Design a protein around this ligand. Sequence first.
Ligand SMILES: OC[C@H]1O[C@H](O[C@H]2[C@H](O)[C@@H](O)[C@@H](O)O[C@@H]2CO)[C@H](O)[C@@H](O)[C@@H]1O
Length: 363
Amino acid sequence: KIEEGKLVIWINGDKGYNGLAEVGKKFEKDTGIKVTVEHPDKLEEKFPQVAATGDGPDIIFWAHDRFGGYAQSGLLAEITPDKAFQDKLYPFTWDAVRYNGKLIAYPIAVEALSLIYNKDLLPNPPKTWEEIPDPGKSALMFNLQEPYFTWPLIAADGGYAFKYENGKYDIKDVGVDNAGAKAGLTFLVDLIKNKHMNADTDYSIAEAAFNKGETAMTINGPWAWSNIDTSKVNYGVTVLPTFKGQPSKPFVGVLSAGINAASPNKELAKEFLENYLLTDEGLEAVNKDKPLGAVALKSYEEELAKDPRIAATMENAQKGEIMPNIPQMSAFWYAVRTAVINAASGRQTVDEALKDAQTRITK
Ligand SMILES: OC[C@H]1O[C@H](O[C@H]2[C@H](O)[C@@H](O)[C@@H](O)O[C@@H]2CO)[C@H](O)[C@@H](O)[C@@H]1O
């Protein structure tokens, strides 16, 4: 319903929207242009619905994987920073938001899942996945409803999204049905079957458990840290357990800011991002609300790199793989989500599930 003269930003609920709003207020003072920060439910799936008929927000925040599918539908505007601006952010972060030669977004931060453990309850964290299942429910709790959390275990011994080869992603070469993904999932289902974990554990349940001091371990991102801080739990962040000597390989996501192609405030959006958001102060404001992880801007990243928790995020990142941004990621996530959920709940076996996932992605 139009939108000229003001900015409407969409960012997920788990990130620093109040922090981003302080940035909005700084822009506002100087420019006179109102900045509105919203966090709707399932904005990543809702963007395409609204953006298609020239609606929605001016700017959108999300991990880079969804962006390539957005780019291909003609929903994003081309971002055009000069080469001097480009030199401020790490080159690999620019590579993430590069679709078909064109920059479709500004890189903000690098996110990776880590092992979060209660130091008072468990002073020394388990080095392997196989030493977790012990006698009773005594174990870890993490979101099992979102494929993003169980991925690290599945990829650990061989699973892969899309075969990466010669710069291209073999879309017809999906690897969720090999023996590495089958072992990862069988291990997870065995945890559930042997009752050390519940199949309905979601984000909120898992978070509550750890913040209330009911669980000694959990798996989460840099955005989770704020909640644990206020909860007063003595926690440490470290590397993901190994599975059969192989490190867990988490999917590396780059929080990105894309600009709607229907937005009449294209230059206002551009000015907010380069002059206000992507500065030391800009990123500091958002980081205070809920941590971002490893930031794209070198200057602020250099200060942030000595923090022990960021160090662990990075180690997990370099042992993982950057997510593909192509348009086949959307269907990839539904296939894996359905596969993990079915298998854990007893709808079908590990072999049945994964085969179906493969088949639906390779169609
Ligand atoms: O579970 C699949 C889901 O994974 C990623 O979503 C992450 C997101 O990037 C993180 O920043 C954080 O919000 O949590 C999400 C997990 O619920 C992908 O970005 C997303 O496309 C995909 O659906």
